[PDB]
Amino acid sequence: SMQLNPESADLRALAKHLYDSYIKSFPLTKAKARAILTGKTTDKSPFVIYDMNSLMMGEDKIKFPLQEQSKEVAIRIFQGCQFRSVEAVQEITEYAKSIPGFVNLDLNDQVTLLKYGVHEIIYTMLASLMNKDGVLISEGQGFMTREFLKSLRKPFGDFMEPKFEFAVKFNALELDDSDLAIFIAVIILSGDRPGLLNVKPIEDIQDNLLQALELQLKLNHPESSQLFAKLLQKMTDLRQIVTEHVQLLQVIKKTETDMSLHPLLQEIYKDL
Ligand SMILES: C/C(=C\CC/C(C)=C/CC[C@]1(C)CCc2cc(O)cc(C)c2O1)CC/C=C(\C)C(=O)O
Ligand SMILES: C/C(=C\CC/C(C)=C/CC[C@]1(C)CCc2cc(O)cc(C)c2O1)CC/C=C(\C)C(=O)O
């Protein structure tokens, strides 16, 4: 069974390092998101976008567009989501640099792990900002309803729904930021990504993160012995969400020309 030894003290040290770096890299933590979503925050309520009227009032309220603002609502929303995804790529990149051993990997491998990892991490962390009713946007200053997003014309009405479906089930696991910091690191350090140069050093880092994660979960969740196994299952699930997402982006690229795909996202999508 579980032991207090030097190995376990090192794994707890790693968990703390990752948590501290995760806090630094991602201002809106799950703890803060949940406080807003339950109202248990003392902060001002987010502005709620639940219909076309409150979307347009929202554009006046929420600050975070030359011929962008000429496009129909669904495209303005979709383009906004793309920009926020690119900001998320930047943050997740900075987080990865804090993962011990990551910056010592060959720079091409660092880039490959991020290329194939970032969307998995985006869907994981998006769950922190979701409840069954909607999602927090612009770092908690807004809340956009799930049914409002579904109401957008085909094919835009379907692009968030699979992320909500993932989030309701993921959120039932009741992970906290301390758990997530390690989970995200595990996903990034996946040795099976296409086109990696040096698989073994990545596998060696991931093995240590997986040990850190299993110990964190045993300590932090006395009421489930299944949680580690369930989280390995979520890692495979996320690869499905991303596949499905990419196919939707194809359908959009094919059917919905006169609508710009962010060049950086194009680069990432190339070989997913
Ligand atoms: C999934 C999505 C938007 C990502 C929105 C988003 C910001 C997700 C990441 C959530 C985290 C990582 C949570 C923590 C956090 C804290 C911050 O302080 C700031 C941000 C951005 C943040 O983002 C729309 C569909 C994808 C598109 C168009 C694409 O890809 O084609
Ligand atoms: C659903 C989603 C982003 C909506 C992005 C959005 C506000 C789209 C609407 C864009 C338009 C129609 C265009 C101009 C504009 C500017 C604003 O400043 C505010 C709004 C509402 C706005 O609306 C992904 C999750 C985002 C997170 C966590 C975040 O961390 O964001």
Curated annotation (Swiss-Prot):
<feature type="cross-link" description="Glycyl lysine isopeptide (Lys-Gly) (interchain with G-Cter in ubiquitin)">
    <location>
        <position position="24"/>
    </location>
</feature>
<dbReference type="GO" id="GO:0048469">
    <property type="term" value="P:cell maturation"/>
</dbReference>
<dbReference type="GO" id="GO:2001235">
    <property type="term" value="P:positive regulation of apoptotic signaling pathway"/>
</dbReference>
<comment type="function">
    <text>Nuclear receptor that binds peroxisome proliferators such as hypolipidemic drugs and fatty acids. Once activated by a ligand, the nuclear receptor binds to DNA specific PPAR response elements (PPRE) and modulates the transcription of its target genes, such as acyl-CoA oxidase. It therefore controls the peroxisomal beta-oxidation pathway of fatty acids. Key regulator of adipocyte differentiation and glucose homeostasis. ARF6 acts as a key regulator of the tissue-specific adipocyte P2 (aP2) enhancer.</text>
</comment>
<dbReference type="GO" id="GO:0042277">
    <property type="term" value="F:peptide binding"/>
</dbReference>
<dbReference type="GO" id="GO:0051393">
    <property type="term" value="F:alpha-actinin binding"/>
</dbReference>
<dbReference type="GO" id="GO:0060392">
    <property type="term" value="P:negative regulation of SMAD protein signal transduction"/>
</dbReference>
<keyword id="KW-0219">Diabetes mellitus</keyword>
<dbReference type="GO" id="GO:1902894">
    <property type="term" value="P:negative regulation of miRNA transcription"/>
</dbReference>
<dbReference type="GO" id="GO:0009755">
    <property type="term" value="P:hormone-mediated signaling pathway"/>
</dbReference>
<dbReference type="GO" id="GO:0090258">
    <property type="term" value="P:negative regulation of mitochondrial fission"/>
</dbReference>
<dbReference type="GO" id="GO:0045600">
    <property type="term" value="P:positive regulation of fat cell differentiation"/>
</dbReference>
<keyword id="KW-0862">Zinc</keyword>
<dbReference type="GO" id="GO:0005654">
    <property type="term" value="C:nucleoplasm"/>
</dbReference>
<dbReference type="GO" id="GO:0043565">
    <property type="term" value="F:sequence-specific DNA binding"/>
</dbReference>
<dbReference type="GO" id="GO:0042789">
    <property type="term" value="P:mRNA transcription by RNA polymerase II"/>
</dbReference>
<dbReference type="GO" id="GO:0070888">
    <property type="term" value="F:E-box binding"/>
</dbReference>
<dbReference type="GO" id="GO:0003676">
    <property type="term" value="F:nucleic acid binding"/>
</dbReference>
<keyword id="KW-0832">Ubl conjugation</keyword>
<keyword id="KW-0010">Activator</keyword>
<feature type="binding site">
    <location>
        <position position="119"/>
    </location>
    <ligand>
        <name>rosiglitazone</name>
    </ligand>
</feature>
<comment type="subunit">
    <text>Interacts with FOXO1 (acetylated form). Heterodimer with other nuclear receptors, such as RXRA. The heterodimer with the retinoic acid receptor RXRA is called adipocyte-specific transcription factor ARF6. Interacts with NCOA6 coactivator, leading to a strong increase in transcription of target genes. Interacts with coactivator PPARBP, leading to a mild increase in transcription of target genes. Interacts with NOCA7 in a ligand-inducible manner. Interacts with NCOA1 and NCOA2 LXXLL motifs. Interacts with ASXL1, ASXL2, DNTTIP2, FAM120B, MAP2K1/MEK1, NR0B2, PDPK1, PRDM16, PRMT2 and TGFB1I1.</text>
</comment>
<dbReference type="GO" id="GO:1905461">
    <property type="term" value="P:positive regulation of vascular associated smooth muscle cell apoptotic process"/>
</dbReference>
<comment type="function">
    <text>(Microbial infection) Upon treatment with M.tuberculosis or its lipoprotein LpqH, phosphorylation of MAPK p38 and IL-6 production are modulated, probably via this protein.</text>
</comment>
<dbReference type="GO" id="GO:0030509">
    <property type="term" value="P:BMP signaling pathway"/>
</dbReference>
<dbReference type="GO" id="GO:0003677">
    <property type="term" value="F:DNA binding"/>
</dbReference>
<keyword id="KW-0325">Glycoprotein</keyword>
<dbReference type="GO" id="GO:0045923">
    <property type="term" value="P:positive regulation of fatty acid metabolic process"/>
</dbReference>
<dbReference type="GO" id="GO:1902895">
    <property type="term" value="P:positive regulation of miRNA transcription"/>
</dbReference>
<dbReference type="GO" id="GO:1904893">
    <property type="term" value="P:negative regulation of receptor signaling pathway via STAT"/>
</dbReference>
<dbReference type="GO" id="GO:0071456">
    <property type="term" value="P:cellular response to hypoxia"/>
</dbReference>
<dbReference type="GO" id="GO:0001221">
    <property type="term" value="F:transcription coregulator binding"/>
</dbReference>
<dbReference type="GO" id="GO:1904706">
    <property type="term" value="P:negative regulation of vascular associated smooth muscle cell proliferation"/>
</dbReference>
<dbReference type="GO" id="GO:1903845">
    <property type="term" value="P:negative regulation of cellular response to transforming growth factor beta stimulus"/>
</dbReference>
<dbReference type="GO" id="GO:0048511">
    <property type="term" value="P:rhythmic process"/>
</dbReference>
<dbReference type="GO" id="GO:0000122">
    <property type="term" value="P:negative regulation of transcription by RNA polymerase II"/>
</dbReference>
<dbReference type="GO" id="GO:0070165">
    <property type="term" value="P:positive regulation of adiponectin secretion"/>
</dbReference>
<keyword id="KW-0963">Cytoplasm</keyword>
<keyword id="KW-0805">Transcription regulation</keyword>
<dbReference type="GO" id="GO:0010888">
    <property type="term" value="P:negative regulation of lipid storage"/>
</dbReference>
<dbReference type="GO" id="GO:0090575">
    <property type="term" value="C:RNA polymerase II transcription regulator complex"/>
</dbReference>
<feature type="domain" description="NR LBD">
    <location>
        <begin position="10"/>
        <end position="271"/>
    </location>
</feature>
